[PDB]
Amino acid sequence: PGIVELPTLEELKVEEVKVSSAVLKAAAHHYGAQCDKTNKEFMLCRWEEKDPRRCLK
């Protein structure tokens, strides 16, 4: 009965990494130390709030 809300295309238009998987596995251990605060905030929101639509930013 209730409509689903969804974000628009421009609420997802984002500058992407465009970077492969070995380039990324190599720098994993440094990306886990630097850029950990934002990543862990995103994780806490994504698991505390069970909605993707509530964490795009």
Partner 1 sequence: DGPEKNYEKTLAILQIESEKAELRLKEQEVRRLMRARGDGPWYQFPTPEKEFIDHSPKATPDN
Per CB under 8 A, does 40 bind partner 1?
no
Q: Which of 27/44 has CB closer to partner 1?
A: 44
For residue 3, what are its two tokens?
Answer: 């409509």
CB 56 within 8 A of CB 12: yes
Phi, psi (deg, nearest 5) at residue 16: -90, 165
Per CB under 8 A, does 53 bind partner 1?
no
Binds partner 1 (CB under 8 A): choice among 10, 47, 56, 57:
47
Binds partner 1 (CB under 8 A): choice among 20, 50, 56, 57:
50
